[PDB]
Structure 1
Amino acid sequence: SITQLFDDLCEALLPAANRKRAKRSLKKVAYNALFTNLFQLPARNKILMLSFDLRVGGLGPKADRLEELVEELEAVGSVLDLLVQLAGSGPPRDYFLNNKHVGRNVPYSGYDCDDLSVFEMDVQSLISREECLCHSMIQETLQVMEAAPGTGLPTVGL
């Protein structure tokens, strides 16, 4: 029932390994903010508005995937008006781009040379992952090499 549906919302979004009084106190805040609101254009169009903002930043087939999935999702409309508010807030290969040597019915458009320099940034991203990792190994120990006895260690606290 509905007095449990906010509490189960409270449990799943709380991880684990006080925090045993906090669940029961946070369902109180869940009801206390339910009735702050209650005292005081279709649904699919907002999804079309976010897919447009995908298309401006590139990634066309992804926006086409969003819309082919919401055309069958018309068969829930009160869920999407909530979904669009949590689509901006987050947590706190293919070979057919530049290949014509496959198929038999394969396009002729010749060269590109307008994002083939951004086909080398495709490799710059991969090397920039594996160089940011070696930057996150040298700092987590350089914070250790300069330290003092028992300032972060509670073993001196015994």
Structure 2
Amino acid sequence: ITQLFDDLCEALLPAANRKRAKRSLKKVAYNALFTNLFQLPARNKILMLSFDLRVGGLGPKADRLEELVEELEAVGSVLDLLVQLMDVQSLISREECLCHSMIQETLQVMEAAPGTGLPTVGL
């Protein structure tokens, strides 16, 4: 258990000082773990999220979320952790925001003061 918190702190560390940040992030893991410790069934919490699925459409996906928790019976504390954390018109509206987020990301640099967006001039 003293190591399973050390391997967890490695995965969430984004790859590239990577030798002292792990030492400081292990503090944020412990500084936050003991705040809750200082201070209801399991399957019901899924259904309350299954309901909110069906309301906004996408019925079969909600009929799948219940299909797996029924076979996961034949571990309960694991799913209790997960719950804590026009088809064409959307296509033409995606490939149009790209051309709005591609000509903007590069015109904001092409027209500015000489040497702002350039990293070599910042040396």
Deviation at 1:156, TM superposition (A): 3.0
Higher helix share: 2
- State the alpha-carbon separation in 1 of the partners of residues 41 and 121 from structure 2: 63
> Is 2:50 aligned against 1:51?
yes
Deviation at 1:130, TM superposition (A): 1.2
Deviation at 1:157, TM superposition (A): 4.3
Structure 1 residue runs without a partner (length 5+): 86-120
- State the alpha-carbon separation in 2 of the partners of residues 27 and 34 from structure 1: 11
Output one character per residue of 1:102-146: Cα deviation in whole Å (capped at 9) or x when no partner: xxxxxxxxxxxxxxxxxxx11101111111111112101210222
Instruction: For CA contacts below 8 A with separation 6 or more, give which structure has more relative contact order.
Output: 2
Deviation at 1:154, TM superposition (A): 3.8
* 1:134-149 equivalent positions in 2, closer than 5 A: 134-149=99-114
> Cα RMSD between the aligned structures?
1.6
Does the 8 A contact of 2:109 with 2:117 survive in 1?
Answer: no
- State the alpha-carbon separation in 2 of the partners of residues 128 and 73 from structure 1: 40
Kindly tell me: are residues 152 and 133 of structure 1, through their superposed partners in 2, closer, same or farther at Cα, counting changes over 3 Å? closer
- State the alpha-carbon separation in 1 of the partners of residues 119 and 46 from structure 2: 52
Kindly tell me: are residues 154 and 65 of structure 1, through their superposed partners in 2, closer, same or farther at Cα, counting changes over 3 Å? closer
Q: Percent identity?
A: 100
- State the alpha-carbon separation in 2 of the partners of residues 75 and 9 from structure 1: 29
- State the alpha-carbon separation in 1 of the partners of residues 53 and 78 from structure 2: 21
- State the alpha-carbon separation in 1 of the partners of residues 30 and 121 from structure 2: 45
- The count of corresponding residues between Structure 1 and Structure 2 is 122
Deviation at 1:12, TM superposition (A): 0.5
Kindly tell me: are residues 151 and 46 of structure 1, through their superposed partners in 2, closer, same or farther at Cα, counting changes over 3 Å? same
Deviation at 1:11, TM superposition (A): 0.5
